[PDB]
Amino acid sequence: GVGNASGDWHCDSTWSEGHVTTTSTRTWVLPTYNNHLYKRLGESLQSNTYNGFSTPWGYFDFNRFHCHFSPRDWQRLINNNWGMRPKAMRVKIFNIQVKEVTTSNGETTVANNLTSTVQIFADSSYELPYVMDAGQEGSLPPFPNDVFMVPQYGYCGLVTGNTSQQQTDRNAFYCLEYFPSQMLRTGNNFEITYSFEKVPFHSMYAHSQSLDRLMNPLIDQYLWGLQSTTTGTTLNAGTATTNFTKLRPTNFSNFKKNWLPGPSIKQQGFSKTANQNYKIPATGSDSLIKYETHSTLDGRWSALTPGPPMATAGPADSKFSNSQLIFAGPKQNGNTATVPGTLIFTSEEELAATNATDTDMWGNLPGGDQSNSNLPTVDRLTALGAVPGMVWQNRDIYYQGPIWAKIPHTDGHFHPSPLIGGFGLKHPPPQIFIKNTPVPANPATTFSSTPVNSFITQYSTGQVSVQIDWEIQKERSKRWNPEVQFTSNYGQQNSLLWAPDAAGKYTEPRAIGTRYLTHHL
Amino acid sequence: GVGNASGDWHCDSTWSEGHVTTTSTRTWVLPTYNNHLYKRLGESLQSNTYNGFSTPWGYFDFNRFHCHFSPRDWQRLINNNWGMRPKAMRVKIFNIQVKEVTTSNGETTVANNLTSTVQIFADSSYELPYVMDAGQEGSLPPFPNDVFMVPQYGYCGLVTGNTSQQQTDRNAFYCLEYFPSQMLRTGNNFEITYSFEKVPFHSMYAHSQSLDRLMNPLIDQYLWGLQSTTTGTTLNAGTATTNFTKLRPTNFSNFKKNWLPGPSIKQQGFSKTANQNYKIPATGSDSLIKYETHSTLDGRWSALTPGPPMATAGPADSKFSNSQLIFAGPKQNGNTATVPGTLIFTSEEELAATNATDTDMWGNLPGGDQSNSNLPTVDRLTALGAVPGMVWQNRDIYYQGPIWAKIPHTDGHFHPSPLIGGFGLKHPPPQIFIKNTPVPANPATTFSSTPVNSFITQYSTGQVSVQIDWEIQKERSKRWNPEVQFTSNYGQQNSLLWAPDAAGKYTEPRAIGTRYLTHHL
Amino acid sequence: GVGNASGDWHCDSTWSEGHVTTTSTRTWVLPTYNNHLYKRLGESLQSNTYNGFSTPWGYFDFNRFHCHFSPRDWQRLINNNWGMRPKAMRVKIFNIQVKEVTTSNGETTVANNLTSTVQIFADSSYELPYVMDAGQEGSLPPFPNDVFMVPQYGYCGLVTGNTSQQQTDRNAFYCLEYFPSQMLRTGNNFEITYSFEKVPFHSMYAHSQSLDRLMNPLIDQYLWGLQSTTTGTTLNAGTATTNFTKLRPTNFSNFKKNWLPGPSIKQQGFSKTANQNYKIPATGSDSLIKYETHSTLDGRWSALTPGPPMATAGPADSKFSNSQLIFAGPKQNGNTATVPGTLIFTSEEELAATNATDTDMWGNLPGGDQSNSNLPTVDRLTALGAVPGMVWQNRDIYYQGPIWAKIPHTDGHFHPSPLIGGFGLKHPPPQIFIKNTPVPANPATTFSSTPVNSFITQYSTGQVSVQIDWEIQKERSKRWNPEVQFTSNYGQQNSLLWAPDAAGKYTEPRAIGTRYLTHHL
Ligand SMILES: [Mg+2]
Ligand SMILES: [Mg+2]
Ligand SMILES: [Mg+2]
Ligand SMILES: [Mg+2]
Ligand SMILES: [Mg+2]
Ligand SMILES: [Mg+2]
């Protein structure tokens, strides 16, 4: 009822053998969006052209690791386990409070509206465009004490061509009121359980072996290969002779191998040092999107980012590329920056053990056929798809990164591991929608068929609990020497990091991946 | 109670074999009508003369197809089925909220009145004048997100003569408080179930055969007929001779037939092009009602419209008549128009397969008896009632048209299919009345027998759910070639049709009938 | 629910054989602390340097005897029992009322917020820094009619060095939202039971025997000892001779004894008479902390106070030291005083029966080896730790003093009896935290990922009950003559002491220990 709480606060984590359960509770605030309306969106902006609808609904997003793990819990996870994956999820929305806002001569006053409801439903059949996996804001804040605003639900429709936002007969419009939903007054609560499909464990380890060094460095191969086609050390000089050799130690680059580095697409490398880059504007015919690796879908350019899993530059190197995820640093509050130091660069350098380098190339190959009179040019293999015998590691997941992505509803897909990182799921955690039910204001006393457009101003607030059961696999290495471990090593600090400062503001100072432990190939 | 919702939101449609259930929930707002009073209505206006009462009650109207079907659901229905009819209905009124309005120096303020009630009863015995089947506004809005105002209940009484509104001893007055009703506070809800009597399936198909072409075009008839009464090709010329002939192919117009086109009454045809019509004023002795086909009841004229089912002009033709239903187009907000393009014209052209044409005539017949010296005039059969051997198709139902009508309580009726379209029912879905119970304002401290006339200003709001079970009959044609199908074919549109626009306004762009599929005779 | 009390008032004490149960109910008021935030604390102040966090949480403190005993009950306890210890505890928090505060042009107005909650949890696993045992304010007021403010929870972190407040990687941050907590609306209550570990009985008696007088004063010892090394009464004079003697009566100071006075550390003695002390400033290089006995931890000075149990000066003597607990007298409202008469001095003079004197020394010992030509200096034993054969009594507990302390979580500890007095417990009564759940104010209608920082002003209030079962051991003395008893002996008083005065203010006029009864060694 009114004077009885419909749920309690729960924010712990229980570790067991092969399992860990996270529990997170936060307070949310839901305003009335679009003034209770559905607005048709759309704008012709060349490669940025889009169309769709903004809805009056809000939705819950739990798609970031820091929503579920405290920094210390993340450390417990990554320093001791080789793998992890989500198993189950339970969500609760309770302690609903609908507030009525009234304006007067001076300030505005808020009051409880005990009879008003909010509507809530989970799109458990995936009938609505899924947007919880687009690397966007709106997830539960990392800090348990923070109160967040429920994000407004909106979706994009089919864009035809690369110049007009105009919709065709294929474009769909989805009305969310057209779905069944629970109506909740201040005493009611909402709950939903979900199970994850079996997904592979994320690999929480860096490789301690290189793909091109899997042989016994003490033994020769029983395989032979061409060593040279002339005597000497000079090109186009010496005596022509087919010099063959048994492949033996210290000539590892020429050993016959069973496996190849995974697929790759060359990205453009930029320096964190301004004057080290070519001057390329943000807009115009020569905008940056042009000089950045990009895919073309229906004439529209889409920057390749982060792109396929590739080895990148170290997080502290002077260079970076679109293959690297960049987060706002602890002192970054705006939405633009000219100083890279205010941002947090992630890195996939551990991938150099099996994956090709993002700003380099997969390799080289002949530009033609050689002969005693023709030396072919050495062509660059800047892009290469799946070839039999290739192996690769997916990119890493981050503490402040996404957890899952919905695998697109298509006939074909190659290695459905979301490129921003995480778990590709056919049936991901369902989107949960919430909306403040409209309450008509004082009506006219004469009938009118015109739809009511006068409403009492309201907003709701409540709590949301999310519990995730995770399956983990402990590292079982036989390595003798100490491993690398994520450790607090900031030294002397005026204000303890990973903690609210003197003013009470909580910020995340660094990006934490999951690859400290190692594993051989 | 107060802090517990008395119902949930439900707006889906479940399709099965031979059945489809629609569920629709909307938010309503009920003001206090007539200031809690019953007012005797009446006005002497010649053929428009009327009398009756306006009541302080409101009522629920679910009598339009778009209240139950989304446009896509309507398409699923009409492209795949030959017939449909309502089977059952369930209505729920819940989440009642009574608001108290108070005025001050500045703006007015609204507040919840937790102890106030609303009264609700269904006229399940049909003791009150039925008005839910008069093609009037007040039904649930087509769009699930729209909030509507509950229409005020009023009824007409017996009009005597064609000049005075004066009532006679036969006139009835109905007091709705004189009925038992449920009283509901914020925690209470109201429910009612209803079953439809067996009614014929509406025919959702156009005929692919003509009534005058039901013969084998390759065979002669064994019947003979008079071919001419003279030799030659000129009238009143040649040699008198009774020329008889066996009725054979390519003389189909003279074949002996078993059936005739249905009854018909000639309507007047008007052009959508202004200068193509005769100038006829709206009022005066020469008003339009005079030149339009009209019936006369007790001296009062009543335009024949839509009138008996007849073949009309195509919806895009330059002409129309009173036989065609006209709806306001998507950009029509006013109540008058001089440009037909802002309106939506429906058509019954598919009826030309069995029904006579509305602006033409049923046929021709002799003005007298012919002889060797007298050629009778060719009289026109502009009106003709039921004749043995006639067959006809009823007019079509529309997405935005009415569903049922109450068959008048009379001794006789011919083919009780409502002329505006739909299902004629003896016992239609009952009218559900709702009213805000009056709450007396501060009384005098001295007794007075005078009826209280000071009330606290109030209004209520809540939700209403309507579920209809429909029986459908799938088309089972042996036709080889593709059928006509209702399809989204608007091409490129700045704003997707059948969807809210950029400002959030939802409008219906076209009228959708149910006759795309075909059936032979 | 709302109109039903969630608990009753209970403030009695039930005495039985070997047991007494105290029950105390008080009304509390909880404001919003830190504006719902966690603030990182810290300040470089040499030996006063500290760092930590203030939390938005409040907590309940029951750690003072006068919270549970009325003065008369304390008298019943101390005049009849030799020992007492806590056995069990039960706490209830009920009749929660959340108030919403609104400001206007004139005065501010308060209103009930029936849907708001408060969060409550007990740190039953001791995962949070324990601060209920630091001799600090915030406990239930001694007077049953007094309404108190719930103290704000804050904790100190590790201080490194003695000059900077800077935190290191070892510093911990604890988020209390990270714990599971009960959420309570106006109808809910919170309860918790606790059992005390077996602890020794506090000794509520003074010794009627001296440690150096445990022999039969009528009998000689069969042990001999050196009486002198010369003839006569003058030092360095007479005839050298080893004079031995059987140890007999009236030479008790030289009797061989089995036990020694307990450990001790010399404290500095100051006069209550200003001009009798040396002039030492509060701050500077020559501050008082310098001339007061102090321990040094990581370079920081910490005054030895109260320090190890030692015999002090009588409570009315002209001198005192840091070994004595000082409370504010009945007329002391400020936080500073120059007149000792406004303060209440406690005393541990009864400890002179077995413990060394605080401002004196444990004893004396030779500064070297003596001979016929060298008389060693008489060195002072100002500090001495545990030596085999030592015995001592702990300091006394007071009516207005602390009950328990948490024994530090360490590998080693010597005699874990808290120095301020009371019971040392490994698992003390758990800290109970309470906080007003934040209620977001009117939000923007456009989504923002920024954490909400606009809240409705609130505060809560309710009742708290605390019941403690105490185990007591009756004195069973064979003493013939009357014992000393704590008695009301204030004589004629304009306003009865231990009672509210004419203005209604309640104050405690004296400190009451527990040592009136006696016991032999
Ligand atoms: Mg987040
Ligand atoms: Mg698909
Ligand atoms: Mg409608
Ligand atoms: Mg009748
Ligand atoms: Mg106290
Ligand atoms: Mg410890």
Side-chain angles (χ1 to χ4, degrees), chain B residues 192-420:
Chain B
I192 191 178
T193 292
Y194 165 85
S195 301
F196 287 83
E197 60 208 61
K198 186 178 66 181
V199 73
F201 278 95
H202 173 73
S203 52
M204 304 191 279
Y205 53 72
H207 278 123
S208 46
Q209 276 193 296
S210 296
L211 190 64
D212 60 326
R213 294 289 180 278
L214 299 183
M215 76 291 283
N216 184 323
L218 309 167
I219 318 300
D220 316 312
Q221 291 202 299
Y222 47 75
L223 292 169
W224 283 59
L226 184 67
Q227 187 180 63
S228 59
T229 53
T230 188
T231 60
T233 306
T234 306
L235 185 70
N236 188 53
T239 303
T241 173
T242 57
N243 294 296
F244 292 95
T245 185
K246 183 195 228 302
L247 289 149
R248 45 212 173 75
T250 295
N251 190 39
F252 301 122
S253 58
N254 286 295
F255 267 40
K256 306 304 176 178
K257 305 187 182 75
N258 285 310
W259 321 101
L260 304 172
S264 66
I265 306 176
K266 178 183 182 65
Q267 293 270 46
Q268 184 58 287
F270 291 99
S271 180
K272 291 176 184 177
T273 299
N275 56 295
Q276 293 300 68
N277 299 302
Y278 196 79
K279 300 171 186 178
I280 305 171
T283 64
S285 60
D286 300 302
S287 58
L288 190 60
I289 185 73
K290 175 179 180 180
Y291 303 100
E292 292 260 52
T293 298
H294 62 250
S295 63
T296 304
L297 185 67
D298 204 326
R300 305 184 297 287
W301 292 344
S302 179
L304 186 69
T305 182
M310 295 177 285
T312 70
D317 291 336
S318 62
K319 281 193 169 181
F320 64 102
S321 70
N322 273 50
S323 288
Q324 286 171 267
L325 299 186
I326 305 176
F327 295 95
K331 299 180 182 182
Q332 189 49 268
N333 303 304
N335 48 52
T336 53
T338 54
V339 179
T342 69
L343 305 176
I344 295 172
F345 291 76
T346 60
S347 178
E348 303 308 311
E349 71 188 310
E350 307 88 301
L351 297 182
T354 57
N355 302 49
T357 297
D358 66 341
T359 55
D360 197 17
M361 58 193 78
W362 190 90
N364 287 291
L365 75 176
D369 290 300
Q370 67 79 48
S371 64
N372 63 294
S373 61
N374 182 281
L375 181 57
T377 64
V378 181
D379 292 340
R380 299 176 157 185
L381 254 173
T382 57
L384 183 63
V387 163
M390 285 180 155
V391 298
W392 63 88
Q393 179 162 50
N394 299 323
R395 79 162 54 238
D396 202 22
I397 54 179
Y398 291 85
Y399 180 52
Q400 54 275 86
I403 308 166
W404 61 73
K406 189 178 85 63
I407 294 159
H409 183 266
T410 61
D411 297 325
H413 53 62
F414 182 64
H415 198 67
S417 185
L419 297 188
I420 301 173

Side-chain angles (χ1 to χ4, degrees), chain A residues 61 63-64 66-67 136-143 400 508:
Chain A
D61 194 315
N63 204 28
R64 284 236 256 176
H66 66 189
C67 298
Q136 294 176 295
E137 304 178 305
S139 292
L140 302 201
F143 201 50
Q400 54 275 86
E508 301 176 302

